[PDB]
Amino acid sequence: APGSQGAPGLQGAPGAPGSQGAPGLQGAPGAPGSQGAPGLQGAPG
Amino acid sequence: GSQGAPGLQGAPGAPGSQGAPGLQGAPGAPGSQGAPGLQGAPG
Amino acid sequence: QGAPGAPGSQGAPGLQGAPGAPGSQGAPGLQ
Amino acid sequence: SQGAPGLQ
């Protein structure tokens, strides 16, 4: 039985990228925010 | 005769879970904050 | 095997996944 | 070519 090949050394195949490489955006990083500049109405007495 | 068809399925490359793109979340508006109180100037 | 004389030295080098961390950049204030 | 058992 002379030489020959066979199954891969590693089955693998997907190579590297995709859900490996670019699995997409991570947890939504967000912060709240203020609104404006009230309380200048100022109607004393 | 080597006739064994090495297992060249797809890509032999074997890295793992490369960094995915970054999401953006709650875009709060850092306006200005306080209590809208009157009395600012009693004449 | 196939008598792979060629060493294959790091034929599959690493990958540059260190890029990332989108938490950079400054920010204008209000004044 | 060089006739021999096939390979992939």
B-chain residues within 8 Å CB-CB of D6?
A: 3, 5
Contact A33, B32 (CB under 8 A): no
Contact B42, A43 (CB under 8 A): no
- Six token digits for residue B8: 């060249």
Report how far residue B1's alpha carbon sits from residue A4's, in angstroms, rounded to the nearest whole number. Answer: 6
Method of determination used here: cryo-EM
Q: Cα torsion at C21, A23, B26, C25 (round to 10°)?
A: 20
Q: Cα torsion at A25, C21, A27, B22 (round to 10°)?
A: -20
How many whole angstroms from its chain centre is CA B29? 19
Find the chain B residues whose C-beta atoms sit closer than 8 A to any C-beta of D: 1-6, 8
Residues in chain C: 31
Instruction: Please report, as a single letter, which amino acid is at residue C8.
Output: G
Burial of C25 (0-12, 13-18, 19+ CB in 10 A): exposed
